[PDB]
Design a protein around this ligand. Structure first.
Ligand SMILES: OC[C@H]1O[C@@H](NC(=S)N/N=C/c2cccc(Cl)c2)[C@H](O)[C@@H](O)[C@@H]1O
Ligand SMILES: OC[C@H]1O[C@@H](NC(=S)N/N=C/c2cccc(Cl)c2)[C@H](O)[C@@H](O)[C@@H]1O
Ligand SMILES: OC[C@H]1O[C@@H](NC(=S)N/N=C/c2cccc(Cl)c2)[C@H](O)[C@@H](O)[C@@H]1O
Ligand SMILES: OC[C@H]1O[C@@H](NC(=S)N/N=C/c2cccc(Cl)c2)[C@H](O)[C@@H](O)[C@@H]1O
Lengths: 811, 811
């Protein structure tokens, strides 16, 4: 049907049909009379997966023969979403499968909807790991993702009476066709025990053993025949475990709980023993696998030439003392050589500056669980602080600030400090974020070792986030500039030549309208909600957090409602305001914010005077597959975090690529997006980081804003008095109290500028030609935000490897 | 190579080779350079399993179109063993696969050894269910086995310092190719709650819900293209289960524990809540599935014409009140009609007379777990006792004896009484056992309803237990009489014509020698033990129980050792005495018996004066795959239970079919075996049931035997003084004490007769021609003991259906 989806040759279509029927019969044990739509999905999944096998075997064979430097990306989160369409895209099978299924009397898009998301992450950090794997395969790097195979991923969100309810994400229930169990590579992981000192060094003894069983998932590059591996570990009890008899068998669950469930906190640290066990489990199993593969190439001098380990935040920070443990205790290297190898091998990426998100593990936990690692950490700290002392003699406060060991009621280990000491490179994830790291939280470390600090601005893969989710846009672009841009996104700059092209303008606007129509229909069908597709689609989707300021959005929504009620017969640009995102289960304020949003909808959506000029919808169960639907449909992207709080953002980049304009603060990657597009093509408002700092110095007084802004006062009085909760008049008192007395994120301080900026958005939307021309200018300058660019920079500046766009031989 | 293993045609071999290579590549993601022997097993398993698919689909399609009466065999145990060879045998693929793998450079027998036993049973009862499924498929019955898919089957037994250690049987670790998950047929099972009475009857409310997910395993008939289904249920928590957040997800294990592990007690009742939950789980899920299938054919009058439910012991006895519950509470039938339907649908098989093996559930357990079922049971009891009262007016003690409710400290429900009341047929499993049921434990019930009581003597499948495990014997038989005997075992009578045939005599003896050589080699390789293959192979393999009298065997072994030591230079027929079997983990005396056996071996096997004239070996981890190896190798089968205690035995039949002679008491099926073969062709000894009864009446005094038999006195003095445990002189005091003061099974009473009978065995073994002629007379009369005969009798006399030997069309 459309060109970028590849060829549908008669030989291919005939073959796909044959193999689909073979799988339905032999694999699924069904015939067409009893087969359910789920059976059809599986038959198609197996048919497509068959095409990966040869390429996967020969990619891995290739790395063995050429022995390149291998990259190991360690993460506790890989937010993969669905795999079927992505695989078809990367193998150029989409049109062929579409035709083959059509001839079998099936709708492929209907089959695609059956697949469960692999929701093995919370939000931005987990999704970044996924985009990164796609880019590493597309750039021909010998890369492996290593993580945990959670039995339960991020919970499914249900909204009941306007409140979030959590439901277990039992994603493996029907079996996962996109994994291959590798029980032959099962490895032991050790916990507890004690340290014994012998004539020849320390020994870690009397440990409990949990087995780590690997499951491999293929990661196909874009049409280059490369298939890399994501290896995820599952926890298994040994067979002699706890071995009255019945209870011993039932108690195997205690060991196996390690890989049971993903912790649902993003940007918040909870010091629970189970989480610590998860972090060590992935690290211990992975490092053994890395060392085994390296030996199959005695002398660890060449280890850093053949191995790079990337730590995705501090979650796998135990890699540093674990590598030391293996090199010193097991391989018998001297400390200084082991340390040199470790530093040159490891690099660390920081993803946040919020103090409550930093991992600070109580010493007593590490003492019981990982006694040898605590000893190694103490030694690392002593030698590091000896270096600080020599560089800054007499500066005793620097010594306390820089220590890996934090003093207080409970002694804690600062894992970020451990990562900096033990890594040759430390990076932030957007220019402003990386600068903040050097000037504030890690200032002391930057002064000691300035060469370690780098920036690597985040990106997204334009395979999933354009070709897959927005084929209509991909196609109209391809018609003008060809297909090369899909793996060289900078080519989108060529679209600047078409900004005055009447045909292109019409086509861009038409694709958006179609996307909005499709999404308005998705809403009615699956959620029985009725929206006006002619309205401006105003979208804020991301995890619910005070710093992300969904609350500021709420205030604007109520302002618009109040203005309409004040002057009902005045024209306003119609809007559909969509907010979605999950709240961490224990985060009370985030749960209240969801309830507020739905409560506002309850009032606004049923007011006869408003009509269809304003609708407020909460998008339930926001996840990767939902993002793929809503992002192409959006007109306005809300990126409104308080300046200095969103490290990068990546949702922002997705909207830019897909033809929405952005309203945002100068925070995270927004800064670089505005710089790429031109500030005149962006809706910037609000305090800069410097303004926030000024306000903090004299002190933030919310009352001042309340006193000076009558429209703001009205809203607060409506919230307090029970206008949005007539049955429970005091329901939102916690929210009002926080805003008035305890607001870390200065919601009121940006209110006036935000509302004014929103007026300017409405003005532009009244002029479809000019709206669309600004859109073209955004899409045309989105090239920098490809994760291909990001990964090429990691490769050259951190890992010491060259990317390659060259094809591997096919069959 | 050998004829009974089928044809190896060039087309077939070429095709098998192609598909084997396809599976290694696409299914296993391996090539020949990295493939392990386990990979090769799986490639072969998938290749063979592909051949089942068409036959399985069309068998089930056939039953849907013809709508025959369906047979549902409910069991908590299905002791299946390995599946690969059995499938090849039944599909006539053995020689073709042997050739195909040979040409690929592989040894198929080596690949077969990789498969794990499906050890979903304890011993005889579980293995009977397995033989039954094979026979039902071979006889073309529309039969389904229903059970539980235990994550852990019977434990693997390790012997450490002569003591049994238990290890978890993690049989699903590598994945099970012989199952297909059917999550689309998942059903809810209810627990706890309370009963509410409305204007229109009772309602069971406020229940907790566990999901039952079915897994289907094919059961192929012997070369008739029939493939029946064994459906096993797995426990799954609902997604909203317990739904701080982390703990709620981890607590899903509590629901899912229902299908985690097989209870390892055979012939012993333990009233644990988890076991009760297992029993209801299988019953509730199965009955829903049965009813659903029946409705897909309003009026339940025809239910018993279309449905038979066979209860394998009392373990699924809750089927009776569950059927009533559904018919009365959900379908709104009147009580009397529901009861008529229930009785006509259900039949019950009893497998033991030991009082400690009978299920007697405490009322307080049923009250909490299954409140509605307890009410139904009370009502069943009231109406039943009203019938007893009318038949036997004034007989108040009969009323107390026959009640389903037992009085005492704790009120209990007698499940066997429930089964008799609610079934149209009750059978024992050998003639003597069925007679004992009528004369003793169920005498009162037999007097009330004599028509309900039947006998169905047990059998074994001659596919697994001859063709599969003993191809050499199967072949020499086939050479004389053709192949028809494999599904018509009575044809073995034709071998009586060959009892004087010198060629046949030589061939029978040669096959035994080869089997013994192969087993003597298996022992050296896997267990580093050295046995003389010229010795008489004296074998007792079965679960360890006092009633089975492994202890009597021990006494004979020590007698032989003592006699040798007394007259070292006298000739004795050399013996290898092999004992094996698992002890239930909580059965202390059975654990001591294992320790005694190994302790005797420790003395006997290292005494230079004995040489190779006597060896005592404990066979570790006795299970189905081990039985397939040892049984063909045996010369003498030990079946030495106290008369009246072994309901049938089935191991006895296996040895008979495979060319061993039997030393045994007139107990269980031994009686019918001796009757078939002729008592002159059997080594019968010891008390009959009548003699045991006489002894009980005057009282059993072990001291009398000790006082009168000097050889027995010596043995007891050796045990007591520490001759067999020099470091722990008192180790066996518990055993001595039991024998002397508390022996329920009268070990001493049969000692003299046993020893004398063993002398007669040795005498015959000195004459190879006459030994072998008696063997031929045993094999020739083993036909009655085919489970094909057993199932044909169930079919005609209980289920009301005709067996069919006719082929279904192939492809
Ligand atoms: O279908 C359910 C089961 O599938 C199994 N996969 C098998 S047998 N082959 N895969 C082959 C294959 C081939 C190409 C790509 C990939 Cl990604 C896999 C998995 O090991 C198991 O964990 C899972 O439960
Ligand atoms: O770099 C990718 C993205 O990373 C996000 N960080 C996230 S989701 N961290 N989760 C941290 C976390 C997660 C679990 C536990 C703990 Cl203790 C911390 C940033 O907020 C976002 O600006 C950026 O675009
Ligand atoms: O290989 C491991 C997995 O295999 C799956 N089987 C699948 S996908 N097809 N089977 C087809 C089939 C075909 C013929 C006979 C039989 Cl018996 C099965 C099982 O559902 C799953 O529980 C198991 O873990
Ligand atoms: O009919 C087949 C065989 O059945 C055997 N019975 C066995 S293994 N019962 N287990 C009963 C059992 C098992 C678990 C729990 C409880 Cl509470 C009882 C008989 O002992 C044997 O003579 C006969 O040949």
């Amino acid at each position: 049907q459309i060109s970028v989806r590849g060829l549908a040759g008669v030989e291919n279509v005939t073959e796909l049909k044959k193999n689909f029927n073979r799988h339905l019969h032999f694999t699924l044990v069904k015939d067409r009379n009893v087969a359910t739509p789920r059976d059809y999905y599986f038959a198609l999944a197996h048919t497509v997966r068959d095409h990966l096998v040869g390429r996967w075997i020969r990619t891995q064979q290739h790395y063995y023969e050429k022995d390149p430097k291998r990259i190991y990306y360690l993460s506790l989160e890989f937010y993969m979403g669905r795999t079927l369409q992505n695989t078809m895209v990367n193998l150029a099978l989409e049109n062929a499968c579409d035709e083959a299924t059509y001839q079998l009397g099936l709708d492929m898009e209907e089959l695609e909807e059956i697949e469960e998301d692999a929701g093995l992450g919370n939000g931005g950090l987990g999704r970044l790991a996924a985009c990164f794997l796609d880019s590493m395969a597309t750039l021909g790097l010998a890369a492996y993702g290593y993580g945990i195979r959670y039995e339960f991923g991020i919970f499914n969100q249900k909204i009941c009476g306007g409140w979030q309810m959590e439901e277990a994400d039992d994603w493996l229930r029907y079996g996962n066709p996109w994994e291959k169990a590798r029980p032959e590579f099962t490895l032991p992981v050790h916990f507890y025990g004690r340290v014994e000192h012998t004539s020849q060094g320390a020994k870690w003894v009397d440990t409990q053993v949990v087995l780590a069983m690997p499951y491999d998932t293929p990661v196909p590059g874009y049409r280059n025949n490369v298939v890399n591996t994501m290896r995820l570990w599952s926890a298994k009890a040994p067979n002699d475990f706890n071995l009255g008899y019945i209870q011993a068998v039932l108690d195997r669950n205690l060991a196996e709980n390690i890989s049971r469930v993903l912790y649902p906190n993003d940007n918040f640290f909870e010091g629970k023993e189970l989480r610590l066990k998860q972090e060590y489990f992935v690290v211990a199993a992975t490092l053994q696998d890395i060392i085994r593969r390296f030996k199959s190439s005695t002398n660890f001098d060449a280890f850093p030439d053949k191995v790079a380990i990337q730590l995705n935040d501090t979650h796998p920070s135990l890699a540093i003392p674990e590598l030391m443990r293996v090199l010193v205790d097991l391989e018998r290297l001297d400390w200084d050589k082991a340390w040199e190898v470790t530093v040159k091998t490891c690099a660390y990426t920081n993803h946040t500056v919020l103090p409550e998100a930093l991992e600070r593990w109580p010493v007593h936990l590490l003492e019981t669980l990982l006694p040898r690692h605590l000893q190694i950490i103490y030694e690392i700290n002593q030698r590091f602080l000896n270096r600080v002392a020599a560089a800054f003699p007499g500066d005793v406060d620097r010594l306390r600030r820089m220590s890996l060991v934090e003093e207080g009621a409970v002694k804690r280990i600062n894992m970020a400090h451990l990562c900096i000491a033990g890594s040759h490179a430390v990076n932030g994830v957007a220019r402003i974020h990386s600068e903040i790291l050097k000037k504030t939280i890690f200032k002391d470390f930057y002064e000691l070792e300035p060469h370690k600090f780098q920036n690597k601005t985040n990106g997204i893969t334009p395979r999933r986030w354009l070709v897959l989710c927005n084929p209509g846009l991909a196609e109209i672009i391809a018609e003008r500039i060809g297909e090369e841009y899909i793996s060289d996104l900078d080519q989108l700059r060529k679209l600047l030549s078409y900004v005055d092209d009447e045909a292109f303008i019409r086509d861009v606007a038409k694709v958006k309208q179609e996307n909005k129509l499709k999404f308005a229909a998705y809403l009615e069908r699956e959620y029985k909600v009725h929206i006006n597709p002619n309205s401006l689609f105003d979208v804020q989707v991301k995890r619910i957090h005070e710093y992300k300021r969904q609350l500021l959005n709420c205030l604007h929504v109520i302002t618009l409602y109040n203005r309409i009620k004040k002057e009902p017969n005045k024209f306003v640009v119609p809007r559909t305001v969509m907010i979605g995102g999950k709240a961490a289960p224990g985060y009370h304020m985030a749960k209240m914010i969801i309830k507020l949003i739905t409560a506002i909808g309850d009032v606004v959506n049923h007011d006869p005077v408003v009509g269809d000029r304003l609708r407020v919808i909460f998008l339930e169960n926001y996840r990767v597959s939902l993002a793929e639907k809503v992002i192409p449909a959006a007109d306005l992207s809300e990126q409104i975090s308080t300046a200095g709080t969103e490290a990068s953002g990546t949702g922002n980049m997705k909207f830019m690529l897909n033809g929405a304009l952005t309203i945002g603060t100068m925070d995270g990657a927004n800064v670089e997006m505005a710089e790429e597009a031109g500030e005149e093509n962006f809706f910037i408002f609000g305090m800069r980081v410097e303004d926030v700092d000024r306000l903090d110095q004299r002190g933030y007084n919310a009352q001042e804003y309340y006193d000076r802004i009558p429209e703001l006062r009205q809203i607060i009085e409506q919230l307090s008095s029970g206008f949005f909760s007539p049955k429970q008049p005091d329901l939102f008192k916690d929210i009002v109290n926080m805003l008035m007395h305890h607001d870390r994120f200065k919601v009121f301080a940006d209110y006036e500028e935000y509302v004014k900026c929103q007026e300017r958005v409405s003005a532009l939307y009244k002029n479809p030609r000019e709206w669309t021309r600004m859109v073209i200018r955004n899409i045309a300058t989105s090239g920098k935000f490809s994760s291909d660019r990001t990964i090429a920079q990691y490769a050259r500046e951190i890992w010491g490897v060259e990317p390659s766009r060259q094809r591997l031989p096919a069959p």
